[PDB]
């Protein structure tokens, strides 16, 4: 049932930086056990751009073993950081509080030089 | 960078995997497109090769940066896993190249794992 609670709602998840992802799931019309991920992400990581306002997220979720991959392009009405982040990982519902474990890639430019930075985010569910 | 949006092109990686991207303007994000289309996997040693899987993601047109994902579930095979690619199009050379880093989340029995790699796709 933690699994179906996720599918029915808009759930919130806070990572170690204080940033917050809100996820909504819609069944795929062609892929079984698969959901289109929508929702928004608020970046609260110090030392970064594009903080404090929601950015849409998009991606896909596999309900069979609760694996997700989602992305944000850092462009909205408030700020544009000319970049995108992709997260891929898995939910763990085995503890008393649910956790989403992810690896991420941030593609961006520094002047004319492109780069892709790697990192890891652990999100803990908000109630 | 315009050829890319035009409609349908094939982007082929070092193993012969093929990404077929479709773009539609984002409802709320400036200079951004929703990405859809299909991915045909051919990565050596991997499951779910040789059939189209839908992909989804987002593309930033200002400097041609993309992030997209595939869940490995369709009517032909289910590998109970998902891959996310993030990277940038380099239109320097006579050959355009999409340079990406990817993560694959999967289970081995009861143990979850996330594997990393890199894929370079060339426009066919």
UniProtKB/Swiss-Prot annotation, chain A:
Swiss-Prot/TrEMBL keywords: Biotin, Disulfide bond, Secreted, Signal
GO cellular component: extracellular region
GO molecular function: biotin binding; protein homodimerization activity
Residues in Avidin-like domain copies: 5-127
Protein location: Secreted
Record-listed biotin binding positions: 15, 19, 41, 43, 49, 83, 85, 121
Main location: secreted
Keyword Secreted found: yes
Impact reported for residue 56 to C: This mutant forms a disulfide bridge stabilizing the octamer and preventing dissociation into dimers upon biotin binding
Family: Belongs to the avidin/streptavidin family.
Role this protein plays: The exact role played by hoefavidin in the host organism is still obscure. Forms a strong non-covalent complex with biotin and 2-iminobiotin.
Domain free text: The C-terminal segment plays a key role in the formation and stabilization of the octameric configuration, since the short afifavidin (lacking the last 5 amino acids) is only dimeric.
Subunit structure: Exhibits a dynamic oligomeric assembly: the apo form exits as homooctamers, which dissociate into homodimers upon biotin binding. The X-ray structure of the intact hoefavidin reveals unique crystal packing generated by an octameric cylindrical structure wherein the C-terminal segments of each monomer are introduced into the entrance of the biotin-binding site of an adjacent non-canonical monomer.
Protein name: Hoefavidin
From-to range in the entire protein, with total length: 28 to 154 of 164
